[PDB]
Symmetry: C2
Subunit: 247 residues, 2 copies
Amino acid sequence: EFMETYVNKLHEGSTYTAAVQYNVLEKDDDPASLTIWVPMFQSSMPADLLIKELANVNILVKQISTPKGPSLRVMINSRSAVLAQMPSKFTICANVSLDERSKLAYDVTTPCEIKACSLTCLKSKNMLTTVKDLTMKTLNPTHDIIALCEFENIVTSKKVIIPTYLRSISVNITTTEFKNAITNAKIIPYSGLLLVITVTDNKGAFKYIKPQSQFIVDLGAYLEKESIYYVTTNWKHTATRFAIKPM
Amino acid sequence: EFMETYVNKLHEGSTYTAAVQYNVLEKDDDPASLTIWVPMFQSSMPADLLIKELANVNILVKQISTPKGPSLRVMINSRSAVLAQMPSKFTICANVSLDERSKLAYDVTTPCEIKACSLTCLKSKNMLTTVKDLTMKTLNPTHDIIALCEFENIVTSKKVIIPTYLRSISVNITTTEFKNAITNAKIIPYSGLLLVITVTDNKGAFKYIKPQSQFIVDLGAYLEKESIYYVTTNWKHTATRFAIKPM
Ligand SMILES: [K+]
Ligand SMILES: [K+]
């Protein structure tokens, strides 16, 4: 009922990985605005049905101290039977989650109102590779590979360029397949924003990655001083470039 | 010449660890505001002389992508002979460094103007213990120890309570010495803000810490959405409490 929603199908099949991201407002007189992404989970339900169920949950958060800094404990209730496998308790980085001018007190639970929901359907979880997955594998690297993600703010007409680290390698590495994969990479609303690179061939810069995988890259750390809702509704992804730089 | 400065002597001796934190403005028409803390270094120079030298350096920063997110490469030039041992190239977390509404473009060097400088004199570096130092030592913990740092914003009359993680322990632990050390702990402008707990006796909650040490705790991660200059000039540290919580 009048919920803003987005559904992005980046995988075709009866089963997919659901990457869900909520934009919420604190239920409060002076409300914090924040975005919450749910740990990825599998579904066999049609995405156009799943998004309707996702829109119906109830969310509470509590901000806490952790060894790494402020974190948000998230609780998701009022999950229908369809969402039995949806993670219901988890923790995310509070600085990334909360909008630029939004703050929460610590150690107090606060209910949130869902204002928008995005569902992106990815390949099966075993076919997803992360940056952290590859860092473990690198030995005696000489160079960094960086993705340059370019956006245009369509309302302010500002160009945004965010470099994000992909991996390091020892030093052709820039195969045609690699260049094409970077050029055609997609940005979706998850973990703030998530860069999704399709890896078919795994020669060169894609070494150690399973064939027919999605290499997914978190942009959330670069969005601590943004409103993620604002970004996902006003930034248009216009290009992806890359750089290979000596360490 | 008319530089705002602060000097805090938390150690008496001919030699000390210098903990230096600069508040700067980008040299620019639309300037970013940010705070830069220098890796700790030893000095035998009188603090009232060192602060004058510190005020005279030239600072440049460059914002870059790293595996952990946006970082600021800092370069400190125009160091006089007195500052020979002062770190001149290092990297800090850009989200913590930059003020709430301040942003930098990536991969471009930008000169900064120093607007204020704080020097805090700590014990010798081998007598400083960090949270990370203690996390390595913990095995099968059951509880977290949290420091509750309370401030008053003297201009807005807002109370600020920031819990910060000290350590975990296996489960008396709250000795009189521990309680007194927490009650009397100091907050200084370094790493955003730094909690400094003096450890004389190391029984209980202080186990594994060298006698006659300063246990120093970073608050910077909790200040990503603040202006550190604003905080160090407008927040008054009013109390420190603690909590011991089951994990
Ligand atoms: K944010
Ligand atoms: K900050």
